[PDB]
Amino acid sequence: PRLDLIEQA
Amino acid sequence: MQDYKQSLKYETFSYLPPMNAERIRAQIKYAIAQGWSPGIEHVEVKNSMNQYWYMWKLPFFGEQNVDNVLAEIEACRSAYPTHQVKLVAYDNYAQSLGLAFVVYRGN
């Protein structure tokens, strides 16, 4: 979850 | 009315009937499908509630073969036949476990 779908990605 | 019999539990899936090889295999396959890294933990039964069980070797980072995971479970069981043994799946994106369940209950 959390970092998987960040704005950067 | 039936009386509910109190017994110790083992978290996720422990309220279901004990898993055969097929059911265990499906869970590991699902974990790999999610991109999670399977790992094995084991601990003495009395220490089951500790935050830090013993880690068997290292998490199988990038492992794609469920059979390798199952072989590791057997190898851990042989080394520590009285310990409970828990399969975990590390989710590095959430830095959490995607799944965890006890495969062997110990003693």
Binding site: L3, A9 | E22
Partner: protein, 455 residues
């Protein structure tokens, strides 16, 4: 404007900026305006922008002391509401400088303070708010979040199971503990105080916390699984609220609960910071949401309230049950569950998501389902919510013909069978009956549970 001219002026001249491009730091709001015939869209949008930010009904000289161009909120886009010609979406940008850092209170007060009272609009609905990452970082957020909570409770691979003790009111502390003890020993991860349970003559809070903690520890020893009970610390005053939270920590209670709307945002935010400082999980109940969130033409959509809760702080949030909701509202519900749990939610109008919402590193919150749900709902609940959820079966546990322990076991077996079937790749909602029926062959508790309530 450079000179002071007194008198009433139109809001459009200043607060309607169709050519404005929102900055990344801007807070954005989407209001669904149902205006009274005769009023112009742009003027309605500008009026909402002005009154929510820096505007006044009449020109004041003090505006010239500051730079209204920098500070003012501005309506920047008008859009039609699909299938509803009486209403339009107004998009308003608010400079981040308008808000106290780390204050959901302040942002909420500014957006909903007085625009909802306009005689110009028949209805005003705040649909969505884009909280920029810069603002998000100033907020405490969930004290722990999904991953830390799973590590603390050593729970993995499935949704958690909960139960609200029933009847909501009337039980003594010792009887309350008995009910808690029976539910927990039967296989529920959690039990909870009802939202109405605070400190009543029939059951004072300190007595309740003592008996419940005794029940929790006894069940934990007898099951070998970690257990908790959400002790309600909602109280008349902050001093009382903190006193109860401290006692829960002192006796070793892992989790507490609070009503964030009725208790209030100020109390909730302080409690969330306290919870982080003391390592106590925080379950949030959403009492009063229906007063504010039900009416599609007037009020605040729950998705906004969801974002505020995540910023204010809670490890669990009650989200209702999608099983009752229709497909039109199902996608909306899935929308705020993503908002509750995900790191980055892209804009998706079909799901009611009007803005990209970036949470960065802010942890996700457990979605909590409850209501009149029972074993038969399990397949759909597991499908819709997934693992990072808490399914609470109050009546579905204490209403089992064989008592709490059997009811808990029935729910636990149903949950585990649904999870195992999902992991095996079966379509659990399509095959729900077959899955439950198969599991019932090994569980008399589940079998009679399936007979008690209908499919």
């Amino acid at each position: 404007v450079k000179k002071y001219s007194a008198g009433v002026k139109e809001y459009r001249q200043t607060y309607w900026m169709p050519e404005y491009t929102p900055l990344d730091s801007d807070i954005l709001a989407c209001f669904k305006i149902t205006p009274q015939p005769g009023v112009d869209r742009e003027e309605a949008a500008a009026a909402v922008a002005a009154e929510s930010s820096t505007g006044t009904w009449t020109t004041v000289w003090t505006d010239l002391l500051t730079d209204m161009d920098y500070y003012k909120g501005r309506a920047y886009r008008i859009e039609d509401v699909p299938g509803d010609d009486a209403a339009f979406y107004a998009f308003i940008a608010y400079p981040i400088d308008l808000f106290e850092e780390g204050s959901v209170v302040n942002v909420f007060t500014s957006l909903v303070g007085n625009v909802f009272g306009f005689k110009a609009v028949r209805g005003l609905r705040l649909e969505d708010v884009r909280f920029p990452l810069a603002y998000v970082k100033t907020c405490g957020g969930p004290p722990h979040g999904i991953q830390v909570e799973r590590d603390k409770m050593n729970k993995y691979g499935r949704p958690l199971l909960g139960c609200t003790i029933k009847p909501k009111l009337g039980l003594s502390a010792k009887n309350y503990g008995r009910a808690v003890y029976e539910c927990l020993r039967g296989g529920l991860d959690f039990t909870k105080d009802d939202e109405n349970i605070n400190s009543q003559p029939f059951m004072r809070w300190r007595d309740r916390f003592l008996f419940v903690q005794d029940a929790t520890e006894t069940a934990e020893a007898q099951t070998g699984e970690r257990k908790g009970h959400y002790l309600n610390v909602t109280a008349p005053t902050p001093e009382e609220m903190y006193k109860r939270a401290e006692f829960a920590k002192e006796i070793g209670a892992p989790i507490i609960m609070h009503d964030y709307i009725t208790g209030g945002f100020t109390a909730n935010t302080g409690l969330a910071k306290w919870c982080q400082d003391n390592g106590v999980l925080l379950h949030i109940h959403r009492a009063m949401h229906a007063v504010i969130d039900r009416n599609p033409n007037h009020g605040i959509h729950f998705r906004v309230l969801t974002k505020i809760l995540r910023l204010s702080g809670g490890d669990h949030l009650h989200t209702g049950t999608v099983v009752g909701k229709l497909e039109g509202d199902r996608a909306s519900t899935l929308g705020w569950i993503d908002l509750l749990r995900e790191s980055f939610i892209p804009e998706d109008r079909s799901r009611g998501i009007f803005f990209d919402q970036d949470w960065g590193s802010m942890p996700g919150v457990f979605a909590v389902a409850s209501g009149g749900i029972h074993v038969w709902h399990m397949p759909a609940l597991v499908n819709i919510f997934g693992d990072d959820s808490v399914l609470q079966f109050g009546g579905g546990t204490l209403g089992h013909p064989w008592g709490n322990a059997a009811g808990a076991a029935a729910n636990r077996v149903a949950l585990e069978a649904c999870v195992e079937a999902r992991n095996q790749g079966r379509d659990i909602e399509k095959e729900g009956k077959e899955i439950l029926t198969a599991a019932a062959q090994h569980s008399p508790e589940l079998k009679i549970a399936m007979e008690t309530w209908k499919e």
